[PDB]
């Protein structure tokens, strides 16, 4: 059991992350990455998620930062070599974190390069109201602003808002469609309640014809 | 233009039905059936819907009844020869109406046979909460009761109720899932409203650095 225990450690670490015990998430990821590396090899497609989560938690630990870069770039390669949309989106995510490492490294022109890389990938596969696109636009405007490109920084912040505003539009439509569906489901339920008496009459109508009926009725017909 | 005008006449008649001008729906159907018969032949698969709607409106007109039978049985054949679920369900519907013609004809053992035929078909392809199954069970219990089989009549009426009750169960779940989805869509909308100020700060943060910034800032970096 190796693929068995490796997924467990991914869960362990992911929720040590969401809880914020990061040395304990790094630990979970470092061993998952070690169980897969020693079963499939440390460039194998089976190691891509494990390495990306490992480098994600290495980036957070530096908040070493150089080990985050190795692990995220390895993940990008593993991810980009496969032509699945799931994998291409994970490649985008590895670019997003590689850009986050650049910003920690005060290397702002590369963050722009990695954030743009994430965005070009994500816009091929995601709808114009995906918060992930609001995140890349915002992270891109951060990089541009840190790099002191203030006009392109504003442009990216406004793109972020434009995505966030588009999603409030879609969500309000889905409210009206949910609450409207709810309205019709409720109306049909009452329509069906009012059918059950009329059918119960037909049942009792029949039970009386059988009580009053003798056995010869059917066989003389 | 023949397939062009034939669909129009199906619409015309269908809504002369839903309005209740039945001689005007029969007229629409008789000509659609004549446009398809003289283009594809009067056993062709292209004539199945047109003949079924025609015989459906002939049955209602008798409320002649013999012409309803011809047209519905032709439709059943056209429908059953094709292995599509849409066509098999239409075959079931032709059986339902052929059974309705039997009841008008005081021929109750055949109604049982045709209603059962509808049901065996519909239970292969429909979910246990489809009102169409409540209709067949009810129409079947009518036939059984008219034929003076009172115990099987009750059985079919109770099956009808059992279907109707199952659908009230499914509809209440869909209410809770709609109104619950609505609840979460509303919560995320407010979460997104509270993001737009923080991003607008980042924009104004940047616009001030550009106002205060001169042109040499970027090119000396």
């Amino acid at each position: 059991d190796v693929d068995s225990e490796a997924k467990k450690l991914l869960g362990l670490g992911q929720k040590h992350l969401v809880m914020g015990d990061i040395p304990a998430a790094v630990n979970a990821f470092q061993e998952a990455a070690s169980l897969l590396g020693k079963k499939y090899g440390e460039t194998a497609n089976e190691c891509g998620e494990a390495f990306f989560f490992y480098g994600k938690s290495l980036l957070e630990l530096a908040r070493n930062l150089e080990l985050a870069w190795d692990m995220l770039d390895l993940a990008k390669i593993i991810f980009k070599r496969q032509e699945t949309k799931e994998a291409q989106l994970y490649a985008a995510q590895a670019h997003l974190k590689l850009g986050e490492v650049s910003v920690e490294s005060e290397n702002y022109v590369q963050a722009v390069e990695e954030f743009q890389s994430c965005l070009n990938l994500q816009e091929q596969y995601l709808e114009a109201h995906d918060r992930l696109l609001a995140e890349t636009h915002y992270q891109l405007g951060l990089a541009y602003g840190y790099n002191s490109q203030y006009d392109e920084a504003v442009a990216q912040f406004s793109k972020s808002i434009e995505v966030i505003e588009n999603r409030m539009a879609v969500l309000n439509e889905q409210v009206k469609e949910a609450e409207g569906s709810s309205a019709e489901y409720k109306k049909e339920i009452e329509e069906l309640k009012e059918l059950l008496p009329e059918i119960r009459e037909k049942i009792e109508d029949a039970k009386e014809s059988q009580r009053s009926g003798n056995v010869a009725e059917l066989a003389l017909k | 233009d023949v397939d062009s005008e034939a669909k129009k006449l199906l619409g015309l008649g269908q809504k002369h039905l839903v309005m209740g001008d039945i001689p005007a729906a029969v007229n629409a159907f008789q000509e659609a059936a004549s446009l398809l018969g003289k283009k594809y032949g009067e056993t062709a698969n292209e004539c199945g819907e047109a003949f079924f709607f025609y015989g459906k409106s002939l049955l209602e007109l008798a409320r002649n009844l013999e012409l309803a039978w011809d047209m519905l049985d032709l439709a059943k054949i056209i429908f059953k020869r094709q292995e599509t679920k849409e066509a098999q369900l239409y075959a079931a519907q032709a059986h339902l109406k052929l059974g309705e013609v039997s009841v008008e004809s005081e021929n109750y053992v055949q109604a049982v046979e045709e209603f059962q035929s509808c049901l065996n078909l519909q239970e292969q392809y429909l979910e246990a909460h489809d009102r169409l199954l409540a209709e067949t069970h009810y129409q079947l219990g009518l036939a059984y009761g008219y034929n003076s089989q009172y115990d099987e009549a009750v059985a079919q009426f109770s099956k009808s109720i059992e279907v109707i009750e199952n659908r009230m169960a499914v509809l209440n779940e869909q209410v809770k899932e709609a109104e619950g989805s609505s609840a979460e869509y509303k919560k995320e909308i407010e979460e997104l409203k509270e993001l737009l100020p923080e991003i607008r700060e980042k924009i104004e943060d940047a616009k001030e650095s550009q106002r205060s910034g001169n042109v040499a800032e970027l090119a000396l970096k």
Binding site: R63, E100, R131, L132, A134, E135, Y138, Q139, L142, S160, I164 | E188, E191, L195, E198, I199, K202
Partner: peptide, 14 residues
């Protein structure tokens, strides 16, 4: 300085 990265984890729902 690092409130910027918290706003990002808020723009994405995680």
């Amino acid at each position: 300085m690092p409130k910027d990265i918290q706003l990002a984890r808020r723009i994405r729902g995680e």
